[PDB]
Amino acid sequence: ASPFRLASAGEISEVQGILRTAGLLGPEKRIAYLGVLDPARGAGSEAEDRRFRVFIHDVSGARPQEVTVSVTNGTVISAVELDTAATGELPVLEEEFEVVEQLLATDERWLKALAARNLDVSKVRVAPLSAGVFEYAEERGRRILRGLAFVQDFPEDSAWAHPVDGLVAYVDVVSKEVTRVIDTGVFPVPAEHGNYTDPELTGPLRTTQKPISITQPEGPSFTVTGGNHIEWEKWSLDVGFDVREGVVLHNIAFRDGDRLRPIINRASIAEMVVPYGDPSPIRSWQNYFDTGEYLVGQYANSLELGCDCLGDITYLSPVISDAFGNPREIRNGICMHEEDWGILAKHSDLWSGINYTRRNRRMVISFFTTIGNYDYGFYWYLYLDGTIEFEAKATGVVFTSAFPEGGSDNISQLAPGLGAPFHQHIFSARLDMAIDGFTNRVEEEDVVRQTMGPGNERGNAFSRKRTVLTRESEAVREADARTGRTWIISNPESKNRLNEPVGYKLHAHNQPTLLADPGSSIARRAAFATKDLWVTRYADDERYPTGDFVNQHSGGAGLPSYIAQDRDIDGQDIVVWHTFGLTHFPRVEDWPIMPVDTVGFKLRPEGFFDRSPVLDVPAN
Amino acid sequence: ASPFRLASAGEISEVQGILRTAGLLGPEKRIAYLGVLDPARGAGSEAEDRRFRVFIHDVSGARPQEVTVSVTNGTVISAVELDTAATGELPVLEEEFEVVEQLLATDERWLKALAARNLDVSKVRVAPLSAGVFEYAEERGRRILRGLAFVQDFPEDSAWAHPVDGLVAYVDVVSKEVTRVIDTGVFPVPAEHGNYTDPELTGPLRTTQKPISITQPEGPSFTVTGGNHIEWEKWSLDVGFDVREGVVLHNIAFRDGDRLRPIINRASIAEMVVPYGDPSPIRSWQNYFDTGEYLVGQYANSLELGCDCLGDITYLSPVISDAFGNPREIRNGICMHEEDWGILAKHSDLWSGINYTRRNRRMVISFFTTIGNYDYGFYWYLYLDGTIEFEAKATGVVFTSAFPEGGSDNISQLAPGLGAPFHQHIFSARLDMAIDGFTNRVEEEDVVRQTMGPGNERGNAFSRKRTVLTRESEAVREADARTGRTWIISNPESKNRLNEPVGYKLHAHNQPTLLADPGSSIARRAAFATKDLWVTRYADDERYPTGDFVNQHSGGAGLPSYIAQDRDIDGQDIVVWHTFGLTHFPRVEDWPIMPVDTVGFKLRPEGFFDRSPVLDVPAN
Ligand SMILES: [Cu+2]
Ligand SMILES: [Cu+2]
Ligand code: NA
Ligand code: NA
């Protein structure tokens, strides 16, 4: 019934049938992206029309297509031929990754390079990576992957311990041609293994850890209905899943008395970029757009009870399409559970004699993805007191290189001869706001210091200032941790009992943004990542900060082009885009497998409620 | 047997008898502070000598004294008379709190001010607040408290809902004179109650929360020996308790294979200040030094199983002295337990076929204190991967005022006519470092951006730089979130297997520091709070960032005086002092009882280990 229900296996099969019947999905076609479209603005109206957007690749080299289908009515709504040299290539296909190592294994230049290093081609793994846009004219309009080599000494060996530096190859994966093989010189291949399950390296395992048992004897406090609608401790929301963005939260609302009050219409991580800061020509092109180029939902892990998710777990198993339009289930791909979260509020009062303690808890919605060497956990948290928080957890194996003899300003040493280039992991959260409805505005709040003098004779006063962002051209903002800068999203037409507009405050972690030179290719392609906060007027087709087709696309799409429209955002339907990330200078302790590091953001109510919203929490 | 064991009831009783026999504890004497002294530097100290430091107040007006006693030998080691106009007054005594309200209840100016407001004197509570040092020449050398009034409608009423604005009194608590009563005008006393246990205000309590059961069927993984020595998951440390600082951690070390490696010799929160930013003369003097003026350890809560501390809990019950030298047990004053902490490390490898997941845990050591309207939780965390973290949790009831007709730049409105002045909560962590031993140094690490050009032709490179702090005069540092600034504490004489100095990196939250004008009284007395990081050379008597006697000291004591010695800190026995805090613009949701907000810092290994230290964690 709900328009926001997860896509079903039947819907995906019906999309396949509709596309085949229309002549759009013959044997030479591949589905590079398939996802359900959100309803247009206007609750109700069309009783129910489930629409899907599909990107269709052609393996014979014909132009790809973008198609919109109505599964409800069994019709193709629109189909447009794409000019990829202009608007960008489709996302990378899983089947294209395998092509790279196979093609290189028969190329005379590649084999000569491996022979010069005394390496057996049967032991050389090739990491197939996205190409970006650089100086190579022949790559315009072609689907290119670039390959970096690692040695695997035996089938269970961690190849990341043995990078083959000085060597890179470029591959046209449609015409199956090796365009270039670049060899800048022989580097020793680091010889130490990185096998973190080898007892030779782990030593004897600890016997000291006693079990921690987390159970809920009466079951969890949340309910799941309609497959993906959650009700928990006055929160209401729908949990979506898209193969590009991963978990998407819809219709986040809070039950305040008898009113269901909207807070966020749609919350997602709409892009994530991993730029590398090593100027070696072997790696200076390396930038992963995990969301836009690879599609993070495609690589979601199946999460194991007691290991990945601990406690009383409710799972969702979202369905995605494979490259031929067949439904594929990601079994146990989303974990949901509640967690104790310490003290919520506490006071022991001398004058009244009342001692008061209440405990906090949070609802957790999580999934984990694996893209090559890296593994990323995405966690959304809802708290009893109205706080909403996102946290990304980065782990996996760091990307490696040789460590040069005379040292490096851009690479860390992890082991003898083994380096790890500096890099960042930068996320973009797209928050389609709906604070008490769709009439919203953003204010920037700074601390204000005051000088000692008349009206401040003891020099103790301090204050704050709020600046309303009224047009898109002024809504590209930077962090300022020194002045305690935050942003408030408020509804000027909905007031609390003190006659002030209701609002939520965005608290950033104030980590560095994109470090690359502003003239670089990556700064143009990931322009969103150069600023901490952007605000746009809502529009149906403005979904990603990097545009629809990121792979091998130059600049010209995404947030800088949206903002140029200079639309009114003062009491309007607005979208907040928040950039946040980690700057990773790898340490010895990150090797051979990295302990989790985290980054995120949170939103807290700011005069949204008329008093604390957790006065009705019982005393356990 | 350990020199770092908690003080026992017997030791405190023996101190009392020693002082009494020496003639130092007559009927006019009060103990304002009593605490054990740490052993002096000596990696070979064999003879046990337990020494206590005592501040003795005289209620008849004689000069106070600082006394040092040896319990082991039963003697007074030294006793010095204090000139408090010079070096500061002694901490506030719990018994002086009551004196303020009683003295005012018979002062004719106070009674006339209440009569004008139609307030029954029997219902007016007076908060006894520290005085600071301002323009009142008559206060130099006198023991002053200032009082602000709140109305309690009935014995169980929350008086904080009913501030009496426009009225302040000053009291000499030794001679028992009311020195000034200032009445700047009549403000309505806010009438709404703030009784968070009144069903009229809470509504029906939720019936939706199902229990979360956290148990350890085989017991916890840590051991406690000698009363307060902890061993847990390769960590080793001693848990101390001091009536001024609260929980203190001693001898933090990590068992790396065969060797026990020191990390931190002593960790404590050595001061905390709460400055108010309201320029009204009723409150513009208001600054709490909770540690230095009030002593946060003496107000520690007894923590209740299942409410304050959930799980398999091991308690410590520290013993302190009352004002007469009798031992007083703080039953269940310290909670210790381990907690699951999500994923530690995870990777699914395509090439090796190995799927690997490990879970993280942390050890928690906590206590909670109540000073007037505020309640603070102090949490130390030790993680499996070598991370050390501190977290402060602020809750309780906000301090209130009238909300002026026409608004305010310095006060938030919480309810009709009820305001909450802006303020900060600023902490100073004192970290006596011992990274692999006592030869340590601090480096400041900044990200370095590079310009596109020769050697960086694609404009992707970025780097970092480290600056050694060599002398105390250059070791007063500010945060810079934009450049990712952190500080590394290293041992230049202890190298890891890559021949680099072992180190730990301090990650700050980069919140604003003290906002008051640099010429203010509070900026001079809380100078530590104006900068994020200070580094000093260790000295036995440099214990607190604000000096030994904070109450009514005119300024400059502590860190500015220490730093002025300009000692060598490059490869020496050094102490790191980190300032961090919360800037609190109260929100409606903070009323009538405030949900917890948090701030803290963490330290992560930076080449301290030769590879990840958690490869030997089992799968469970
Ligand atoms: Cu990284
Ligand atoms: Cu506060
Ligand atoms: Na919106
Ligand atoms: Na030291």
- Secondary structure element (H or E) that encloses residue A30, with its range: strand A29-36
Q: Which residues crowd ion ligand 4, with CB under 5 Å?
A: B 432-433, 538, 573
Backbone dihedral region of A386: left (phi > 0), alpha (psi from -120 to 50 degrees) or beta? left
CB-based contact A409 B203, cutoff 8 Å: no
CA of B265 to the centre of ligand 4 (A): 7
Continuous H helices in A33-117: 84-87, 94-104, 108-116
SS3 label, residue B589: helix
CB-based contact A349 B397, cutoff 8 Å: yes
CB-based contact B347 A464, cutoff 8 Å: no
- Are the C-beta atoms of residues B253 and B265 closer than 8 Å to each other? no
Tell me: is residue A289 an annotated ligand-binding position.
Answer: yes
Spatial CB neighbours of A287, under 8 Å, sequence gap ≥ 6 = A130, A132, A273, A274, A275, A276, A522, A525, A526, B460
Name which of A212, A389, A524 to mutate to probe chain B: the one with the most chain B Cβ atoms within 10 A of its Cβ: A212
Rounded to whole angstroms, the maximal C-alpha distance in chain B is 87
CA of A167 to the centre of ligand 1 (A): 22
Q: Which residue of B has its CA nearest to A509?
A: B509
Of A213, A216, A395, the CB nearest to B346: A395
Determine if the peptide bond prior to A592 is cis (ω within 30°): yes
CB-based contact A461 B377, cutoff 8 Å: no
> Which candidate, A293, A449, A433, places its Cα nearest to that of A371?
A293
A312: Cα within 13 Å, side-chain hemisphere: 18
What size, in residues, is chain A? Answer: 620
Structure tokens at B150: 């709140």
Buried b (16+ CB within 10 A) or exposed e, A321-353: bbbebebeebebbbbbbbbbbbbbbbbbbebbe
Question: Resolution in angstroms for this experimental structure?
Answer: 1.7
- Are the C-beta atoms of residues A126 and A168 closer than 8 Å to each other? no
Spatial CB neighbours of A336, under 8 Å, sequence gap ≥ 6 = A222, A224, A230, A239, A313, A314, A315, A316, A363, A364, A365, A366
DSSP conformational letter for B101: H
Name which of A125, A296, A332, A458 to mutate to probe chain B: the one with the most chain B Cβ atoms within 10 A of its Cβ: A458
> Which candidate, A615, A396, A608, places its Cα nearest to that of A502?
A608
Kindly list the residues from chain B whose CB atom is less than 8 angstroms away from the CB atom of residue A613: 589
A229: Cα within 13 Å, side-chain hemisphere: 10
Distance CA A275, CA A263 (A): 33
Buried b (16+ CB within 10 A) or exposed e, B325-352: bebeebebbbbbbbbbbbbbbbbbbebb
> Which candidate, A474, A528, A320, A461, places its Cα nearest to that of B284?
A461
Residue with tokens 């690479």: A411
To the nearest whole Å, the CA of A505 is away from the closest chain B CA by 11
> Which candidate, B42, B190, B185, B56, places its Cα nearest to that of B113?
B185
CB-based contact A361 B209, cutoff 8 Å: yes
- Are the C-beta atoms of residues A410 and B461 closer than 8 Å to each other? yes
Distance CA A39, CA A85 (A): 31
CB atoms within 10 A of CB B26: 12
CB-based contact A519 B396, cutoff 8 Å: no
Residue B534 amino acid letter: W
Residue with tokens 């460590």: A403
Residue A456 amino acid letter: N
Kindly list the residues from chain B whose CB atom is less than 8 angstroms away from the CB atom of residue A100: none
CA torsion A88-A90-A95-A97 (nearest 10°) is: 30
- Secondary structure element (H or E) that encloses residue B65, with its range: strand B65-70
Distance CA B459, CA A207 (A): 50
Q: Which residue of B has its CA nearest to A231?
A: B208
CB-based contact B588 A610, cutoff 8 Å: yes
Determine if the peptide bond prior to B91 is cis (ω within 30°): no
Catalytic residue among A374, A383, A538, A562: A374
Question: Under CATH, which number does the domain B196-619 receive?
Answer: 2.70.98.20
Tell me: is residue B375 an annotated ligand-binding position.
Answer: yes
Buried b (16+ CB within 10 A) or exposed e, A270-301: bbbbbbbbbbbebbbbbbbbbbbbbbbbbbbb
Residue with tokens 């020996």: B225
> Which candidate, A269, A297, A288, places its Cα nearest to that of A580?
A269
Tell me: is residue B547 an annotated ligand-binding position.
Answer: no
Kindly list the residues from chain B whose CB atom is less than 8 angstroms away from the CB atom of residue A462: 277, 410, 422, 515-516
Residue B375, phi then psi, degrees to nearest 5: -130, 130
Distance CA B522, CA B8 (A): 37
Kindly list the residues from chain A whose CB atom is less than 8 angstroms away from the CB atom of residue B458: 134, 279, 284-285, 520-521
Point out the ligand nearest to the CA of residue B412.
2
Structure tokens at B60: 């008849």
Residue with tokens 């970092």: B464
Spatial CB neighbours of B132, under 8 Å, sequence gap ≥ 6 = B285, B287, B521, B522, B525, B552
Structure tokens at A512: 């560095």
The third-level CATH classification (topology) of the domain covering A94-195 is: Nuclear Transport Factor 2; Chain: A, (3.10.450)
Structure tokens at B540: 């036995």
Residue with tokens 């990295």: A594
Residue A187 amino acid letter: F
CA of B107 to the centre of ligand 2 (A): 32
- Are the C-beta atoms of residues B173 and B96 closer than 8 Å to each other? yes
Distance CA B314, CA B227 (A): 11
SS3 label, residue B432: strand
Q: Kindly give the pairing relationship between strand B401-402 and strand B418-421.
A: antiparallel
| Angle at CA of residue B121, ends B118 and B125, nearest 5° | 115
Spatial CB neighbours of A5, under 8 Å, sequence gap ≥ 6 = A226, A227, A228, A238
Distance CA A357, CA B310 (A): 12
To the nearest whole Å, the CA of B538 is away from the closest chain A CA by 29
Distance CA B243, CA B328 (A): 11
Q: Which residue of A has its CA nearest to B159?
A: A351
Per the DSSP assignment, residues forming a β-bridge with A266 are: A250, A432
B351: Cα within 13 Å, side-chain hemisphere: 27
CB-based contact A422 B583, cutoff 8 Å: no
Structure tokens at B548: 């030994």
Residue with tokens 């949206």: A562
Structure tokens at A1: 């019934």
Burial class (CB in 10 A: 0-12, 13-18, 19+), A439: middle
SS3 label, residue B144: strand
To the nearest whole Å, the CA of B43 is away from the closest chain A CA by 30
Kindly list the residues from chain B whose CB atom is less than 8 angstroms away from the CB atom of residue A490: none
> Which candidate, B308, B340, B366, places its Cα nearest to that of B233?
B340
Distance CA A50, CA A48 (A): 6
Q: What is the DSSP string of B253-279?
A: EEEETTEEEEEEEEEEEEEEEEEB---
Residue A120 amino acid letter: D
Q: How far apart are the first and last CA of chain A?
A: 37
Distance CA A201, CA A11 (A): 49
Spatial CB neighbours of B546, under 8 Å, sequence gap ≥ 6 = B271, B273, B289, B292, B428, B525, B526, B528, B553, B557, B558, B559
Of B356, B385, B447, the CB nearest to A196: B356
Spatial CB neighbours of A93, under 8 Å, sequence gap ≥ 6 = A30, A32, A57, A323
Spatial CB neighbours of B452, under 8 Å, sequence gap ≥ 6 = A517, A519, A520, B458, B459
Distance CA A426, CA A599 (A): 9
To the nearest whole Å, the CA of B90 is away from the closest chain A CA by 23
Per the DSSP assignment, residues forming a β-bridge with B419 are: B401, B413
Structure tokens at B513: 């520091």
Q: What is the DSSP string of B218-245?
A: T--S-EEETTTEEEETTEEEEEEEETTT
To the nearest whole Å, the CA of B609 is away from the closest chain A CA by 6
To the nearest whole Å, the CA of A546 is away from the closest chain B CA by 18
DSSP conformational letter for A115: H
Tell me: is residue B360 an annotated ligand-binding position.
Answer: no
- Are the C-beta atoms of residues B382 and B388 closer than 8 Å to each other? yes
Residue with tokens 């219902």: B123
CA of B549 to the centre of ligand 2 (A): 25
Distance CA B445, CA B468 (A): 9
Kindly list the residues from chain B whose CB atom is less than 8 angstroms away from the CB atom of residue A520: 452, 458-460
Point out the ligand nearest to the CA of residue B437.
4
Per the DSSP assignment, residues forming a β-bridge with A63 are: none
- Are the C-beta atoms of residues B243 and B35 closer than 8 Å to each other? yes
Q: Which residues crowd ion ligand 2, with CB under 5 Å?
A: B 584
Distance CA A443, CA A486 (A): 9
- Residues carrying CATH 3.10.450.40, chain B: 1-87, 94-195
Continuous H helices in B374-480: none
Kindly provide the residue ranges of all beta strands, DSSP E only, lying in A37-105, ordered along the sequence: 51-58, 65-70, 75-81
CB atoms within 10 A of CB A234: 20
| Angle at CA of residue B74, ends B70 and B76, nearest 5° | 60
Distance CA A28, CA A30 (A): 7
- Are the C-beta atoms of residues B221 and B273 closer than 8 Å to each other? no
Tell me: is residue B507 an annotated ligand-binding position.
Answer: no
Distance CA A470, CA A441 (A): 8
- Are the C-beta atoms of residues A129 and B327 closer than 8 Å to each other? no
Continuous H helices in B498-551: 521-525
Tell me what percent of chain A is helix, strand and coil, each rounded to the nearest 5.
15, 45, 45
CA distances from A118 to A115, A149, A243, A439, A511 (A): 5, 14, 42, 67, 44
Residue with tokens 């030790």: B382
The third-level CATH classification (topology) of the domain covering B1-87 is: Nuclear Transport Factor 2; Chain: A, (3.10.450)
Name which of A124, A599, A612 to mutate to probe chain B: the one with the most chain B Cβ atoms within 10 A of its Cβ: A612
- Are the C-beta atoms of residues B277 and A461 closer than 8 Å to each other? yes
Q: Which residues crowd ion ligand 1, with CB under 5 Å?
A: A 584
- Are the C-beta atoms of residues B425 and B188 closer than 8 Å to each other? no
Spatial CB neighbours of A394, under 8 Å, sequence gap ≥ 6 = A374, A375, A376, A377, A425, A582, A584, A594, A596, A597, A598, A599
- Secondary structure element (H or E) that encloses residue B102, with its range: helix B94-104
Spatial CB neighbours of B420, under 8 Å, sequence gap ≥ 6 = B398, B399, B400, B401, B411, B412, B413, B414, B586, B590, B591
- Are the C-beta atoms of residues B472 and B453 closer than 8 Å to each other? no
Give catalytic residue positions of B: 290, 374
To the nearest whole Å, the CA of A73 is away from the closest chain B CA by 40
Residue with tokens 């007559």: B26
Q: How far apart are the first and last CA of chain B?
A: 36
Distance CA A268, CA A432 (A): 9
Structure tokens at B10: 């017997």
Distance CA B342, CA B360 (A): 6
Under 8 Å CB pairs connecting chains A and B tally to 427
B137: Cα within 13 Å, side-chain hemisphere: 0
Kindly list the residues from chain B whose CB atom is less than 8 angstroms away from the CB atom of residue A354: 156, 197
Experimental method: X-ray
- Secondary structure element (H or E) that encloses residue B561, with its range: helix B559-563
Spatial CB neighbours of B56, under 8 Å, sequence gap ≥ 6 = B19, B24, B25, B29, B30, B31, B32, B64, B65, B66, B67
Distance CA B154, CA A92 (A): 71
Of B212, B221, B512, the CB nearest to A208: B221
CA of A205 to the centre of ligand 1 (A): 27
Burial class (CB in 10 A: 0-12, 13-18, 19+), A29: buried
Distance CA A520, CA B108 (A): 76
B211-214 — which CB contacts under 8 Å span 24+ positions? B211/A216, B211/A217, B211/A218, B212/A214, B212/A216, B212/A311, B212/A338, B212/A339, B212/A340, B212/A361, B212/B310, B213/A213, B213/A214, B213/A215, B213/A216, B213/A217, B214/A212, B214/A213, B214/A214, B214/A340, B214/B310, B214/B311, B214/B312
Distance CA B340, CA A308 (A): 12
